[PDB]
Design an enzyme around this catalytic site. Structure first.
Site, short mmCIF file in Angstrom:
data_model
loop_
_atom_site.label_atom_id
_atom_site.label_comp_id
_atom_site.label_asym_id
_atom_site.label_seq_id
_atom_site.Cartn_x
_atom_site.Cartn_y
_atom_site.Cartn_z
N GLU A 1 3.09 -4.65 7.77
CA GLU A 1 3.42 -4.98 6.39
C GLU A 1 2.21 -4.83 5.49
O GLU A 1 2.31 -4.30 4.38
CB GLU A 1 3.97 -6.39 6.31
CG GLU A 1 4.55 -6.72 4.96
CD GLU A 1 4.45 -8.19 4.63
OE1 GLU A 1 3.32 -8.67 4.40
OE2 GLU A 1 5.50 -8.87 4.61
N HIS A 2 1.05 -5.31 5.95
CA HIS A 2 -0.17 -5.17 5.16
C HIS A 2 -0.49 -3.70 4.92
O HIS A 2 -0.81 -3.29 3.80
CB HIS A 2 -1.32 -5.86 5.87
CG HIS A 2 -1.65 -7.21 5.32
ND1 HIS A 2 -2.67 -7.41 4.42
CD2 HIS A 2 -1.09 -8.42 5.55
CE1 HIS A 2 -2.73 -8.70 4.12
NE2 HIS A 2 -1.78 -9.33 4.78
N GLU B 1 -7.18 -14.13 5.69
CA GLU B 1 -5.91 -14.70 5.27
C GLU B 1 -5.43 -15.77 6.23
O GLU B 1 -4.77 -16.73 5.81
CB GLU B 1 -4.86 -13.59 5.14
CG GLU B 1 -4.39 -13.36 3.72
CD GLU B 1 -3.43 -12.19 3.62
OE1 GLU B 1 -2.80 -11.85 4.64
OE2 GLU B 1 -3.31 -11.62 2.51
#
Ligand SMILES: CCCCCCCCCCCCCCCCCC(=O)OC[C@H](COP(=O)([O-])OCC(O)COP(=O)([O-])OC[C@@H](COC(=O)CCCCCCCCCCCCCCCCC)OC(=O)CCCCCCCCCCCCCCCCC)OC(=O)CCCCCCCCCCCCCCCCC
Ligand SMILES: CCCCCCCCCCCCCCCCCC(=O)OC[C@H](COP(=O)(O)OCCN)OC(=O)CCCCCCCCCCCCCCCCC
Lengths: 440, 54
Positions: A59-60, A136
């Protein structure tokens, strides 16, 4: 309009299917904007221990660059036409949706193909995103809500893929290579497990043409998950330096379809939600909320109904100080047992109205409508029209709630995840004994 | 740990064991820890062969 003609007049979401299995679905309207997105049926639930965290990594990497659009070119198209591109990957779903003008629908869909089909997954980009994911993760450690919910999933579905966090362990983050990401996107972004969902001013015929022109060259026509095992336990991450103590207690809820979802939500609507900066406070009809506002037990609480394909967590999460966990746990269990033993008609009517407001107000704007289309097509296999939801809520009564809550709450071993100054938190035996009443 | 869910049942088990011992004593061998001469009317003019306390 008497709210019946209103529900009947909601435009119908046409659903089609390409030869690859792409379930193209759209809900035309009058707005000049639109939200077109792709919902993948990938997520951490489909990831083994070694592959855990690859979904978040992919996704990143999705928006960084594509083979046809090298790097910022993909970004350049998104901003230059004013579109907002976004993605979200939960434990059992992934989605990339691009809000844009209805005129730019031909372009956006093409980009939506490029992001999903022809990614780049560059190695230097992989290193940079590996660092970013590590920071993150250290960010996600900060807030106690996400940490507590991940703890709940770990202690409720221990020994199963559902226990895995979405981002995965930090170990896997460093040790995930490009081969793993390529294999993940190859075997989890397959055509049948895809929903191209669009809302706003898009006509279904145009969406079908664009999908058949850009998404045609996709997978043909397997990790089909395993039934996870709820295991009532408790995790206590006692850390007295934290300001407040976050607790989350959940029982094995229903599945995605599992019609008992409609009553349970109503029951949860009875308990409701509250925090410090609310309105009426000591007058809100939710007994637990009124008690919390009167005695200032907590700074927050809510009732969640996280439901997965074959199982799900149903319960409440509250944030209170270090010396009010016991009292609020008692009152929460008391509200639960009261609902199971004696629901009363008036509270059921209030819950029905509250749930009607939930479903109706949540489905406004292109983004929530498109998200609902994608999620419903993935989970229910259809899009449950609001009229059907209205009928299902109307069928609910006091007896139905009293029975459904009894089947899920009364004398059931719960799963508890507490974090912070949780010395006051009752021992698991006391919590389990709270699930049953000697007066009933 | 809280007392009620754990040590109440632990104490119930302890009480059961002590009742086992006491009831064995009373029902099977009551005059085991006593002295037989205590079953004689007190006569101040004669003493028992031995004077031992409990
Ligand atoms: C009769 C059957 C029991 C009954 O109807 O209990 C109703 C009620 C308990 O209601 P519940 O729905 O089971 O629990 C929720 C309550 O809000 C109470 O919730 P709570 O979290 O405040 O307390 C939980 C727990 C807290 O633990 C206790 O109360 C301890 C129970 C005794 C053992 C430890 C102390 C002695 C050693 O309460 C109990 O276990 C029940 C109350 C005590 C019953 C036994 C009393 C005589 C013991 C000898 O207890 C009483 O009314 C007590 C008097 C009547 C029963 C005894 C005679
Ligand atoms: C002697 C009986 C009491 C001691 C042994 C049982 C015990 O410690 O608790 C059993 C019962 C229920 O206690 P608990 O499991 O805390 O549940 C309370 C309601 N939620 O607590 C009791 O007191 C049992 C009911 C009364 C007899």
């Amino acid at each position: 309009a008497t709210y019946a003609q209103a529900l009947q007049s909601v435009p119908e979401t046409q659903v089609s299917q390409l030869d690859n299995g792409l379930r193209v679905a759209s809900e035309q309207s009058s707005q000049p904007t639109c939200t077109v997105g792709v919902w993948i049926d990938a997520g951490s639930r489909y990831e083994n221990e070694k592959n855990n965290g690859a979904g978040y990594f992919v996704e990143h990497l999705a928006f960084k660059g594509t083979k046809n659009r090298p790097g910022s070119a993909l970004e350049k198209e998104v901003e230059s036409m004013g579109a907002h591109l976004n993605a979200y990957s939960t434990r059992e779903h992934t989605a990339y949706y691009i809000k844009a003008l209805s005129k730019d629908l031909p372009k956006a869909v093409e980009l939506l193909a490029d992001i999903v089909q022809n990614c780049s997954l560059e190695d230097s980009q992989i290193e940079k995103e590996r660092d970013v994911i590590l920071q993150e993760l250290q960010e996600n450690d900060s807030s106690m809500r996400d940490v507590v919910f991940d703890y709940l999933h770990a202690t409720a579905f221990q020994g199963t893929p559902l226990a895995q966090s979405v981002e995965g362990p930090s170990e896997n983050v460093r040790k995930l290579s490009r081969a793993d990401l390529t294999e993940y996107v190859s075997q989890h972004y397959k055509a049948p497990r895809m929903v191209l969902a669009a809302a706003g001013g898009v006509e279904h015929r145009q969406l079908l043409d664009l999908a058949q022109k850009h998404f045609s060259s996709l997978s043909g026509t397997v990790p089909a998950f395993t039934p996870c095992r709820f295991t009532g336990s408790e995790i206590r991450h006692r850390d007295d330096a934290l300001p407040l103590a976050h607790v989350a207690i959940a029982v094995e809820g229903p599945g995605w379809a599992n019609p008992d979802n409609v009553p349970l939500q109503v029951a949860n609507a009875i308990i409701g939600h509250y925090d410090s900066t609310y309105g009426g406070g000591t007058h809100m009809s939710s007994t637990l909320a009124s008690v919390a506002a009167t005695r200032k037990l907590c700074q927050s609480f809510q009732t969640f109904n996280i439901c997965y394909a074959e199982t799900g967590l149903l319960g409440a999460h509250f944030v209170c100080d270090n010396m009010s966990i016991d009292d609020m746990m008692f009152f929460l269990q008391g509200q639960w047992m009261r609902l199971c033993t004696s629901a009363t008609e008036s509270e059921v009517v209030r819950g029905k109205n509250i749930l009607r407001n939930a479903l109706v107000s949540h489905l406004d704007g292109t983004t929530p409508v498109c998200e609902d289309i994608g999620r419903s097509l993935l989970t229910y296999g259809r899009r449950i029209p609001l009229a059907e939801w209205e009928s299902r809520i109307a069928e609910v009564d006091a007896s139905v709630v009293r029975e459904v809550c009894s089947k899920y709450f009364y004398d059931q071993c719960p799963a508890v995840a507490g974090l912070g100054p949780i010395e006051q938190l009752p021992d698991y035996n006391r919590i389990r004994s709270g699930m049953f009443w000697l007066r009933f | 740990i809280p007392f009620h869910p754990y040590y109440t049942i632990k104490d119930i088990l302890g009480a059961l064991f002590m009742m086992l011992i006491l009831l064995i004593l009373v029902l099977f061998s009551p005059d085991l820890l006593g002295d037989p001469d205590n079953y004689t009317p007190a006569n101040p003019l004669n003493t028992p062969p031995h004077i031992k306390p409990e």
